[PDB]
Design a protein around this nucleic acid. Structure first.
Ligand SMILES: [Mg+2]
Ligand SMILES: [Mg+2]
Length: 99
RNA sequence: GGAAAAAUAAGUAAACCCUACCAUUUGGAACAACAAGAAGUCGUAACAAGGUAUCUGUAGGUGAACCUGCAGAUGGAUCAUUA
């Protein structure tokens, strides 16, 4: 089971990798960013449609210049995209991915 | 005789204190909401006889809605049965 293979997308400049910490509501969450900062993310209008996100998922996060404290949830990683990220050496090898 | 200074008595009374207030703003320890939205939590009170009909007053209980007592209203789920 999976949605069609598409290229694992990396953190471009202005984005950061993140892991979901707790659930807020109104389509919001607290994320731990691999920037090293906690932020409060809002979920994309795109993602609100397609991909349901939950706790401890690994997500890509589009950042904001002005408010660093808020960030936008960009895309969710499939656990395979994640293990691949670890392979590539983008995100640290000690991280908990749950199924 | 006139008359400056200086003094005198009573008054007008500014300003500064003490008391007690009113008005228009304002600083403030300590408390601390409300409306809107939705992919957080616990349950499911209400809409159907919401699965114990709701609802009003009151009173008591109580994670949460709510629950129970008494009197009341159909906005009721009855306009209606002496033989
Ligand atoms: Mg809710
Ligand atoms: Mg009470």
């Amino acid at each position: 089971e999976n949605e069609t293979k598409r290229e694992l997308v990396f953190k471009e400049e202005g984005m950061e990798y993140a892991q979901v910490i707790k659930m807020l509501g109104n389509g919001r969450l607290e994320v731990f960013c691999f920037d090293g900062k906690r932020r409060i993310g809002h979920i994309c209008g795109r993602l609100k449609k397609k991909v349901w996100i939950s706790m401890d998922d690994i997500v890509l996060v589009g950042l904001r210049d002005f408010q660093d404290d808020k960030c936008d949830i960009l895309l969710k990683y499939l656990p395979d995209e994640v293990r691949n990220l670890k392979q590539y050496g983008e995100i640290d090898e000690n991280i908990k991915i749950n199924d």
